[PDB]
């Protein structure tokens with residue numbers, strides 16, 4: 336019996352309720368911070384504060400996408416969505432990356448327009464006050480996280496947020512005391528936007544690899560092929576497909592050409608057990624064929640060449 | 643021998659060279675049209691001409707994505723991309739939709755800013771000349787396409803382009819003779835942007851359905867399940883997965899629980915032939931299991947409920 340070795344846990348686990356509560360609290364806090372920073376930066380006509388608020392918007396969007404994916408990954412698979420709704424997490428990550436690129440591009444264009452035909456005034460007091468408030472808020476968030484895995488990830492993320500806020504505060508301090516240095520705002524916007532795009536590049540690469548039906552990063556083609564070929568009875572392998580619904584949901588398929596004096600049920604059971612134990616594939620479908628002498632002659636029955 | 647029934651055609655077909663040439667010519671013509679219209683609209687400070695140029699940019703991006711996908715869908719499958727590069731077409735369609743949304747949103751914001759605090763001047767002569775040039779170019783393109791499938795699709799697309807250009811020309815004519823009606827430009831921008839978003843919605847829906855690993859639109863769950871269950875020997879079915887790499891590349895997988903007094907090779911061959919003939923699946927992997935009495939009791943061995 337395929338898929339009968341494990342069991343599906345129904346209902347909502349108590350730890351998942353805690354995770355949902357933490358995500359709700361983090362989303363509320365980050366949204367309040369983003370709204371306050373947007374108001375302050377608009378009052379100060381500052382673009383660095385726009386960059387910080389855009390980063391907070393990216394954080395909020397990522398957490399909201401995570402919450403939406405968590406809610407979606409509980410409905411049963413339908414007749415139109417056979418695999419379930421696990422791809423929603425990847426789609427939400429892609430949406431967050433795209434939105435970050437949009438806002439960063441808008442901010443970069445605004446900063447570039449500011450730099451040449453430098454016609455803008457920046458309120459030093461308002462910008463300094465907003466930057467100080469943002470730095471204090473980041474420090475308070477870091478202290479709360481230290482007092483209270485996901486918490487450690489939030490702690491390091493808040494430390495990075497705090498470093499960026501310190502940079503913005505330094506720029507605001509420079510502008511406030513020396514009003515002639517208004518150019519520190521577009522320059523800081525440029526630096527932080529480039530940093531944001533560089534930070535978002537790896538997630539975009541991973542999302543694209545998942546979406547293009549590529550092999551999962553951790554799972555290797557050669558280890559899986561060698562595991563399948565090591566099963567007693569298997570002679571060859573073709574049409575070995577490995578892809579991931581998300582970072583944790585991996586699917587596998589293959590055609591196994593077994594010997595004539597082999598038991599297809601035993602081969603199938605052993606191969607499924609080996610794949611599940613070694614690689615933890617959520618789904619695995621193996622087509623047990625018979626190794627005809629013509630199998631080793633078909634062009635399409637040949638594995639991809641070594642990289 | 644599963645997958646040995648068809649044959650793979652190598653090289654480049656003569657008709658594909660012609661298709662590439664047509665795509666190159668169309669991209670060149672649309673890019674020249676877009677550049678001319680951008681120059682004219684910028685000279686005229688018009689936003690309707692920006693909307694038409696944005697539509698031309700969307701057309702150019704879609705054709706360029708099609709060309710890139712056509713070039714990519716010739717490399718052999720690697721060890722990191724087992725299925726090939728067919729998902730590139732869907733990714734390019736999604737990218738074109740996202741870019742269209744970006745430009746449309748920018749134009750909509752500009753038009754909204756124009757409408758309230760109406761501080762802008764529109765050169766009637768330049769806008770009228772650009773609109774007349776665009777209408778004449780669309781008419782010439784339609785005539786050329788009529789003189790010379792893909793050509794008919796281009797013809798109807800150019801007819802729609804020509805209708806939009808006629809609307810822009812009517813707005814320009816109204817503005818030129820009556821300069822007090824500058825509001826006709828933001829209003830036209832709004833109408834055409836809403837039309838563009840409404841037109842782009844269905845493609846976004848289809849792309850999302852493909853990317854979320856959903857069932858292909860044409861292929862139905864029940865017909866495939868009934869085809870599989872009609873094979874002499876099959877007693878049940880579970881883990882039936884149907885999804886599409888693109889609009890034309892469909893993949894299928896299933897676990898077949900056959901009778902004890904059945905031949906797995908014959909069942910597999912018959913099921914593969916039936917699926918290929920009826921639905922034309924590019925890839926098909928079927929796991930032929932043995933129908934234990936406990937199969938009809940497992941929760942995970944049950945098909946999704948009827949919609």
Ligand SMILES: CCCCCCCCCCC(CCCCCCCCCC)(CO[C@@H]1O[C@H](CO)[C@@H](O[C@H]2O[C@H](CO)[C@@H](O)[C@H](O)[C@H]2O)[C@H](O)[C@H]1O)CO[C@@H]1O[C@H](CO)[C@@H](O[C@H]2O[C@H](CO)[C@@H](O)[C@H](O)[C@H]2O)[C@H](O)[C@H]1O
Nearest residue numbers: 357360361364394401428476483485488489491492538541
């Ligand atoms: C009492 C209440 C407690 C609530 C706790 C809530 C915790 C849940 C949210 C935690 C959170 C948001 C923080 C929001 C602000 C803080 C909240 C403010 C609260 C104020 C009260 C922190 O996520 C941060 O993400 C960064 C990048 O996003 C990452 O940094 C990175 O670069 C660094 C460069 O130096 C480097 O050092 C570091 O190693 C890198 O990983 C940080 O390490 C990580 O901390 C995001 O949670 C999750 O974290 C995952 C880790 O990756 C993140 O990535 C996953 O998916 C990726 C693709 O899907 C995939 O690519 C990843 O492999 C995968 O893992 C998830 O997407 C995200 O959902």
Ligand SMILES: CCCCCCCCCCC(CCCCCCCCCC)(CO[C@@H]1O[C@H](CO)[C@@H](O[C@H]2O[C@H](CO)[C@@H](O)[C@H](O)[C@H]2O)[C@H](O)[C@H]1O)CO[C@@H]1O[C@H](CO)[C@@H](O[C@H]2O[C@H](CO)[C@@H](O)[C@H](O)[C@H]2O)[C@H](O)[C@H]1O
Nearest residue numbers: 664667668671701708735783790792795796798799845848
């Ligand atoms: C001598 C040189 C000849 C060169 C010929 C080049 C031909 C190749 C390009 C032709 C082309 C660009 C035209 C560019 C400007 C014209 C060129 C100017 C040349 C000047 C010399 C015309 O594509 C147009 O696309 C429109 C929507 O995009 C579509 O309209 C639609 O709504 C109408 C609402 O009323 C309605 O009526 C109509 O029924 C609808 O379909 C039009 O019917 C269709 O004509 C696009 O080609 C292909 O067309 C496919 C058809 O759909 C299009 O969709 C495919 O994929 C979709 C998701 O991937 C999926 O959703 C579709 O199901 C699928 O089919 C492809 O994406 C595209 O790649």
Ligand SMILES: [Zn+2]
Nearest residue numbers: 390394492496
């Ligand atoms: Zn942050």
Ligand SMILES: [Zn+2]
Nearest residue numbers: 633636645646
């Ligand atoms: Zn073969």
Ligand SMILES: [Zn+2]
Nearest residue numbers: 697701799803
């Ligand atoms: Zn067009």
Ligand SMILES: [Zn+2]
Nearest residue numbers: 337897898931
């Ligand atoms: Zn099965």
Ligand SMILES: [Zn+2]
Nearest residue numbers: 339940942943
């Ligand atoms: Zn079962």
